[PDB]
């Protein structure tokens, strides 16, 4: 045999030994799954909820601005509908991790807004449109509203995007936990601890508690090292939470005030242009329930040994090769560490 | 309507559908529509025309 | 005599978490032959410190996995008895592509009698986008009508 | 046989036919070499001469500037010798086609000149040298002398480098001419025209002039197409000729005036810095002798037929298969065309 140390006779061959190894693998994976399931479900729930909530906020702000345009500036419709839809589509896209520039969003928005204002509100009476687009930027007709909107929405959308990425990365690492494959020696030790007693003809003998402790410390060597990075991740997320909704809702008020500011100088503008041309409660509850799992990677070997059939009394137990009266006594992990380091640096540099 | 080639009851139905309907539709597939015609013998389905926002 | 213009400056690259990238560097013409040294974010890198990074006789920096040596501004610097010359820094950013999760279980029909609902979630976490990786493509939720 | 059309008996086998083919190849290569030798040697001579003349001009300007520093600014020597040598070495390098930036040359020159001026002319009384180098550019101490010198030398060095490149490319195309390999059918036709008469037992029969004309028009099909581009190359070179020496000679006057301009503001500069820290005849003769070769690619088949044994009388001559009393009647080329087009566009855009 190659796993069960044959002290004398044996009831199992090499094939039954491979079978015991596969069952040991399945049992270890099931135990890790049972340990991680509650936290995994919590983070998956919150990720889904916040993504849906942000999409709802974007849609609400979108057709609120649409309604305000429809009520106060009917001469600017339906062009206003088109460029407002474009802007809020780009906003939702930037929220979902796409490569979008916020300042460029605001600039395209105002470059689309100004010509229809000039043609339908100031000079009622098309192909010179690009010249007007240029006059939007060259005369700074909207004053400091564009820079104000740029900063206001950029701050909130960036923190929101980083928050969603952090939630997804937490889901990913916790899901990789129960799929962690260990070394061959660790597998042979788990097989010896759980099943090699059956090869010797024993029916109800359980492994020693101290033997389980040493086996798990040998197996989970690299896995415990994830604890520091997981704690720093939880703390950085708590720092980041202590808003995207307020900015996207006040966008229409700011745009209406900007239109009024532009209209206040129409006398000289038309002449010179003709001449030239519970959410906060959900984040707080998530953080409070997540702080209870800061010791997830430190209590995992204890969980594996306490939730498996063990002889805690260390009397008449299986030490891995014989029945004794008293026991005498990285790559995937590195991937998890690197992803945690990245998300922690992002959370640190944000707040 | 009545066809010239053969004296039989022809029916033509038009359905509008606004941009607001497509942009507010949050289904899994593209906004599709199908046509069902009813006869004395049974029913018949047509092609699924998917109206999308470019 | 040492020249100012580098024969070939390192090029910035986008590489996945598992991808491998080689940074080429041809020092400027000079007698004696320029000693090429790599600096990650204005700080030298030790080839013996990590298995993932190694220095080649023809002045090349090879990275097998984007895990053991993450993103940064890699710069090639040639040293000689005359003076030193800095090349144009290459912005190497490691990007992670979005990857779909399996279909969860169908939820119970909220309505006891008549038209009900059943949901199935699909998160973007296997793998989750990193350092500005492209987000998952398609829908995240699945909803079907049920009759109880 | 596969080349000599056997009208009846024949004195040669297939092996003697391959021998005649190889001798035809050697004869064609020798004829092309004899045709191209005069033009090739002319352009090689002039290329060598102009390169040597330019190197002489660079050395003369170099030690002219050296003498002016030694006579007018002895306190700046021997540092002046060092950076003047560096500058003129880089000048010679850029002249010979190397990848050298002229603006960087002038900037390094002035960055080396300013600190020694500050330490030996303005503040009589080293490791803060780079700070002084920075103050050269941050305070714009040399005024507009650097831009003036940059433009003045860039114009002349660029036209000189392009002139040398055009000469070298002419050498390249004329040398590629005599190595042109032709098609199998062209080779068989040359073998039939020059040697297949021997297979029939004829001793002194020469091929018909019109037969030579048709054979050469079939062979030199793509080679004649080079005539337009070669003529345009000659004309563009003549346009370019109608200076590098004057600029490199006035360099010392400009540098001395720049030093005087710098010294005129020493009062505030020292305080703020201490607180902070025949040739034209040769081109004309080359162009005049080169214009005599403008019909080189158009008169080449005529040369091949007139410098080979032919029956210009068209009486009792070899038509390729029998003795008659009266005759009845690309890739490498594309490479040459592309290089000629490029050099012609450069010569056009220069002058
Ligand atoms: C958490 O970890 C578990 C364990 O690793 C993981 O379960 C796995 O899910 C993936 C989903 O991608 C399964 O892989 C699939 O296998 C099927 C059948 O062979 C393929 O059709 C799938 O291919 C799709 O994606 C490919 C990506 O390259 C495409 O090439 C292809 O065209 C398809 O689009 C896919 O490879 C895998 O089998 C399971 N593992 C087991 C043992 O069942 C789970 O995804 C992880 N994440 C979460 C949050 O659950
Ligand atoms: C926007 O909401 C208003 C109510 O505030 C509603 O009347 C209108 O139909 C909505 N329009 C769109 C485009 O959804
Ligand atoms: C063994 O069992 C006894 C029962 O009273 C208990 O007191 C003791 O703590 C147990 N040993 C260990 C190692 O837990
Ligand atoms: C990388 O270097 C370039 C200059 O070579 C600079 O513009 C850029 O900001 C640097 N990026 C980082 C992340 O340091
Ligand atoms: C050129 O260099 C020589 C070095 O022997 C020097 O004597 C001479 O003065 C310099 N040039 C001129 C033309 O004076
Ligand atoms: C041409 O041929 C005739 C004989 O047929 C001869 O007399 C005459 O000299 C020849 N002339 C030339 C120039 O070939
Ligand atoms: C998820 O989407 C599809 C499956 O429909 C694939 O392109 C790929 O598996 C992706 O991650
Ligand atoms: C869920 O949907 C189907 C299974 O019904 C597959 O395409 C795939 O497993 C997906 O995740």
Author numbering:
A (entry chain B), D (entry chain A): 62 to 186, 192 to 308, 315 to 349, 383 to 434, 456 to 477
B (entry chain G): 100 to 153
C (entry chain E): 154 to 301
Reproduce, without paraphrasing, sentences from the article in which this PDB structure was first reported:
Guidance receptors of the Uncoordinated-5 family (Unc5A–D) have emerged as key players in navigating cells and axons (Hong et al., 1999; Leung-Hagesteijn et al., 1992), where they trigger cell-cell repulsion in response to extracellular ligands such as fibronectin leucine-rich repeat transmembrane proteins (FLRT1-3) (Seiradake et al., 2014; Yamagishi et al., 2011) and netrins (Hong et al., 1999). In agreement with previous findings (Verschueren et al., 2020), we show that Unc5 receptors directly and functionally interact with the morphogen receptor glypican-3 (GPC3).
To produce complex crystals, we mixed hGPC3core, mGPC3core or murine GPC3 residues 31–488 (mGPC3488) with Rattus norvegicus Unc5D residues 32–307 (rUnc5DIgIgTSP). Strikingly, all three datasets revealed an octameric assembly. Two GPC3 molecules wrap around each end of the Unc5 tetramer. The electron density maps calculated for the GPC3-Unc5D complexes revealed extra density extending from hGPC3 N241, one of the predicted N-linked glycosylation sites, toward the center of the complex.
